[PDB]
Structure 1
Amino acid sequence: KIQVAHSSRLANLIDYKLRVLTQDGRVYIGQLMAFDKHMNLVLNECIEERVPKTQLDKLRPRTLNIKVEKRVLGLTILRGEQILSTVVEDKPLLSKKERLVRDKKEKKQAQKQTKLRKEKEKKP
């Protein structure tokens, strides 16, 4: 499927589509953007998947097909208290090289902003 870097922390992984497990047995799958000290994180396009009480008997030990009722909720902010564990689903729309490119161009543009602001403030 997908191989995550053998040493990769929550800061190394951004924009990866994640799979988030809460205490209540439901899952939030989507792109991570930010997170925090106490690990409450922000997902971009996320869908909460749930195993109904009626399908649950199908998971108890004996090819299984579970009907997982899920609903779509975009740009949420989770709470660190509820989060249990996190897994990686996919890798970002952009490669590593391309993200280096956009990072460098973004930084250069950011410096250009500071110069254009400084010299717009100084003379007038």
Structure 2
Amino acid sequence: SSKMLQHIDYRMRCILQDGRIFIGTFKAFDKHMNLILCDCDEFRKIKPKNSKQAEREEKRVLGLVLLRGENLVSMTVEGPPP
């Protein structure tokens, strides 16, 4: 089977090696399943180092990113296909 092959072409939050979520309009898979995420961005925790300061995420966009196979912790859908 090729499970993701139905859920590709939509903006999908792929998870990282370090716990980010990156919503790229995913393209395709492999045997290593290295990701080719188009119209793809990222966002990770802006750690306050404290509690009276709160936690946010600063916006980063790569556009089209070729995430090497060692990346995925998961792949979920966060945007329908445009």
- The answer (yes or no) to whether the contact 1:55–1:67 under 8 Å persists in 2 is no
Partner residue, 1:77: 66
Q: Which has the higher strand share?
A: 2
CA separation in 2, counterparts of 1:37 and 1:57? Answer: 43
Q: Which runs of 5+ in 2 are unaligned?
A: none
Match runs of 1:40-55 below 5 Å: 40-54=34-48
Tell me which of 34, 38, 59 is aligned to 2:32: 38
TM-score with structure 1 setting the length:
0.56
1:29 aligns with 2:44: no
1:88 to 70, 77, 80: 77
Count, aligned residues: 80
Q: Where do 4+ consecutive residues of structure 1 move more than 2 Å? A: 55-58
Distance 1:40 1:76 in 2: 10
Report the identity percentage. 50
Q: For 1:79-124, what per-residue CA distance to the aligned partner results, in whole angstroms no more than 9, with x for missing partners?
A: 121211111112212xxxxxxxxxxxxxxxxxxxxxxxxxxxxxxx
Quote the offset at 1:10 in angstroms. Answer: 0.7
TM-score (norm 2): 0.81
Task: Pick 1 or 2: higher relative contact order, CA cutoff 8 A, min separation 6.
Answer: 2
1:24 partner SS: coil
